[PDB]
Design a protein that fits this description.
With about 160 residues, the chain is α/β, with parallel strands linked by helices. It has helices at about 25-35, 45-50, 95-100, and strands at about 1-10, 40-45, 60, 75, 90, 105-115, 130-140, 150-155. One of its GO terms (biological process) is dihydrofolate metabolic process.
Length: about 160
């Protein structure tokens, strides 16, 4: 299984692209629980924001930089090799990684905001044409999470 993980707003603007979502904590716990025990493919600029492997999960970094190394990170150099990774693979970037991967993935975990982010970076369009809602849960508002958000889980429509 190849899954997207993304957070975005009512205009599909990605919030704090490349970073762990320290600014939406419900979402950082959601990421934690999905990818633990599994494989996280990240854009290079995503790994460099973080700066070290996440524990308990296979960390894979996509980069065309021959000298890249980090202890506990597996490297891939092209899109094509992601479809070769074993187990449950999660794809976490990065606008161009999402455009490249959106028609390839089986499913999508999307955190959606009633609200606005500041960025210039966009998740690709998706419609009820191609996707179905397997799950839709309103996130818990409190002091740490004060923007209204839903966790969607969409699966590509098969057969």
């Amino acid at each position: 299984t190849l899954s997207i993980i993304v957070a975005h707003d009512k205009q599909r603007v990605i919030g704090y692209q490349n970073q762990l979502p320290w600014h939406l904590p419900n979402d950082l716990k959601h990421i934690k629980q999905l990818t633990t025990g599994n494989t996280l493919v990240m854009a290079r600029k995503t790994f460099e924001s973080i700066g070290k492997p996440l524990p308990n999960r296979r960390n894979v970094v996509l980069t065309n930089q021959a000298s890249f190394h980090h202890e506990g990170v597996d490297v891939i150099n092209s899109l094509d090799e992601i479809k070769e990774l074993s187990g449950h693979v999660f794809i976490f970037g990065g606008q161009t990684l999402y455009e490249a991967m959106i028609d390839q993935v089986d499913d999508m975990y999307i955190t959606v905001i009633d609200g606005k982010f500041q960025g210039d970076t966009f998740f690709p369009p998706y419609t009820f044409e191609d996707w179905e809602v397997e799950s839709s849960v309103e996130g818990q508002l409190d002091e740490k999470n004060t923007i209204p958000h839903t966790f969607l889980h969409l699966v590509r429509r098969k057969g």
